[PDB]
Design a protein around this ligand. Structure first.
Ligand code: HEM
Ligand code: TES
Length: 399
């Protein structure tokens, strides 16, 4: 069994240990055992296997009361009913209105909004960078942008977004005391409950109102609340990491940065290789076997929990080759990654996340062509967030 270090002290060694022990291996998540899927081919297979569900009531550890809400990771699994917790035909019903809102056409009408948030945040970088002062790319640029974009889509007031970010920081950190974590989870549920009620009595041009007023069976209020929570949480968290890890990877590989600025390699292709090599998700919790799953050299027992170790999956040497642990935007398999998932629960906002990074990254390097880091890589740790690739900071000189 591999114990996942909640402090993320040795992410590179742990990721390689997971790859070496895979494609299926036992992990320990803060005292709770589970199975981690670390192989790319096995992941794609299980992600489309209908004997694996997200419903926590299918977990034997939850049924028996062995895992309770005292577990610091329980907020990642015991969530309100939504597209993230259901499978089968009900899943399509809880997802279809959202996917209609995230089409290639639908995002075109949203593209100018993103471009304005980007331009506003670039000005914040310039203001904080007066007199050659080092600026935190994260806190000034990468962290606020995805929250402003998902808030505009969902209809979250601008005045409320700081509070949401404050809640999410405590929610993700393993250093949050468990009584405070549970209080924040409750306060967040109460916030989105009251927002859904407010939008029910006053709909707007936003996705929350669309989820309430669709004209199949209408979503229950619980399901709208659950979808809203999953959309804001995933919608703001992942893209922050993507923007920062892409900048970090290209600044430390200047010859590849030259390729994208000169147009030899598209930004969309650099974003794909960032997702494969250093993506926003480390481990995805959690799936549960409704019956014994015979793989042929291993069995997944009924009721067992199954984690998708997407970071290890991205480093799969069988699919990507011997240099899988290297960042190379020119590799042929960069588009074959599954860092947005696979199967029916594949990220519904994958196109929006790709668009946000595809706007922000060239915007950043056009506005500040000579930007460079103010800290070396060994002084940029991950935050203690076990399941997410969350960077502490990225100080830069604007140049
Ligand atoms: C770089 C940015 C992002 C990454 C890497 C990412 C990745 C993922 C992954 C790995 C999953 C779950 C796959 C699984 O179940 O195994 C997921 C689910 C989900 N994501 Fe994303 N995501 C990103 C951005 C977004 C955005 C922008 C939105 C919304 C606009 C979003 C909304 C969701 C939702 C609602 C789910 C649950 C879908 C379901 O269970 O049917 N995410 N995402
Ligand atoms: C894990 C995640 C952030 C946490 C999200 C999760 C989707 C379901 C969910 C809804 C909540 O109420 C809290 C956070 C969670 C648990 C997201 C899937 C993509 C992103 O990485």
């Amino acid at each position: 069994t591999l114990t996942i270090d909640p402090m993320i002290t040795d992410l590179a060694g742990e990721t390689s240990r997971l790859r070496a022990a895979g494609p299926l291996t036992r992990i320990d998540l803060l005292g709770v055992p589970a199975l981690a899927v670390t192989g790319h081919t096995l992941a794609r297979q299980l992600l489309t296997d209908t004997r694996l569900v997200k419903d926590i009531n299918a977990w034997s550890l939850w049924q028996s009361g062995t895992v309770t809400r005292q577990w610091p990771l329980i907020g990642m699994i015991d969530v309100d009913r939504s597209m993230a917790t259901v499978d089968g035909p009900e899943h399509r019903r809880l997802r279809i209105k959202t996917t209609q809102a995230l089409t290639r056409r639908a995002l075109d009408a949203l593209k100018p909004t993103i471009e304005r948030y980007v331009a506003e945040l670039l000005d914040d970088l310039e203001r904080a960078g007066a007199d050659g002062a080092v600026v935190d790319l994260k806190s000034v640029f990468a962290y606020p942008l995805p929250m402003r974009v998902i808030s505009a889509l969902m209809g979250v007031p601008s005045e409320d977004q700081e509070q949401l970010l404050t809640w999410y920081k405590a929610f993700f950190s393993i250093l949050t005391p468990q009584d405070e974590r549970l209080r924040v989870i409750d306060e967040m549920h109460g916030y989105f409950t009251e927002m859904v009620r407010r939008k029910t009595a006053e709909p707007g041009d936003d996705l929350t109102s669309a989820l309430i007023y669709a004209t199949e069976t209408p979503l229950t209020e619980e399901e709208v609340i659950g979808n809203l929570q999953a959309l804001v949480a995933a919608g703001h968290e992942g893209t922050v990491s993507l923007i920062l890890t892409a900048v970090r990877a290209l600044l430390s590989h200047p010859e590849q940065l030259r390729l994208v600025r000169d147009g030899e390699i598209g930004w969309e292709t650099a974003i794909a290789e960032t997702l494969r090599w250093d993506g926003p998700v480390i481990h995805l919790l959690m799936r549960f076997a409704t019956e014994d799953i015979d793989l042929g050299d291993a069995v997944i027992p009924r009721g067992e929990g199954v984690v998708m170790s997407y970071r290890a999956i991205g480093r799969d040497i069988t699919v990507h080759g011997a240099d899988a642990d290297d960042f190379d935007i020119t590799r042929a398999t960069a588009a074959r990654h599954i860092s947005f998932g696979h199967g029916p629960h594949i990220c519904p906002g994958a196109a929006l996340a790709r668009l946000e990074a595809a706007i922000a990254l060239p915007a950043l390097f056009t506005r500040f062509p000579h930007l460079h880091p103010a800290l070396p890589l060994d002084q940029i740790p991950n935050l203690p967030v076990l399941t997410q690739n969350d960077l502490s900071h990225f100080p830069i000189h604007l140049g």
